[PDB]
């Protein structure tokens, strides 16, 4: 089924967020969200996202991943939101048939991991996730446990948590 998004009260914001220290390449090493996830799936492959901070304090955000036979890219702009560490998708008013998103950096140490919360609407359909980012692809058990704990705190069952499989194609 479809779990409702937690209130923002339950989503910490990283105190004193430093946009220029969050810049750079991250691997998506965990994700928990309210979308379905069935068991005869192909495993979800790890991909990377590069946050490039601009002068104007927006990020150019580029993701790269591996499909079945080719590398894929996705590029978009995140602009600052209401508090440091919060961003929204895109520079101008929601283009005719568009997506909108809120992004909140919950925690990060900049040089190892980050947990970032996303609420997305697309074609009037709502979803949310928490993404666990790493500077490297290796995810150790204590951090997996902390992410499972955090995801439960937002109302997500274990079966809505995935740790993407590390791969070498495209993302290095």
């Amino acid at each position: 089924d479809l779990i409702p998004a937690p209130p923002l009260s339950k989503v910490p914001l990283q105190q004193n967020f430093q946009d220029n220290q969050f810049h750079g390449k991250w691997y998506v090493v965990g994700v928990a969200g309210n979308k379905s996830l069935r068991e005869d799936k192909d495993p979800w492959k790890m991909y990377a996202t590069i946050y490039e901070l601009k002068e104007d304090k927006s990020y150019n955000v580029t993701s790269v991943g591996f499909g079945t036979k080719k590398c894929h890219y996705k590029i978009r702009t995140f602009v600052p939101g209401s508090q440091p560490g919060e961003f929204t998708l895109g520079r101008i008013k929601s283009r005719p048939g568009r997506t909108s998103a809120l992004v909140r950096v919950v925690s990060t140490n900049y040089n190892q991991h980050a947990m970032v919360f996303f609420k997305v609407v697309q074609q009037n359909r709502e979803s949310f996730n928490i993404t666990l980012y790493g500077r490297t692809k290796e995810l150790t058990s204590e951090l997996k446990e902390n992410f499972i704990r955090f995801s439960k705190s937002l109302g997500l069952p274990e079966n809505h948590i995935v740790f993407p499989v590390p791969i070498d194609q495209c993302i290095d």
Binding site: V31, T99, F118
Partner: peptide, 13 residues
Amino acid sequence: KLVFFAEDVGSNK
């Protein structure tokens, strides 16, 4: 389905 399955999901499609 999606290669880009976390973050601003679907924003490319």
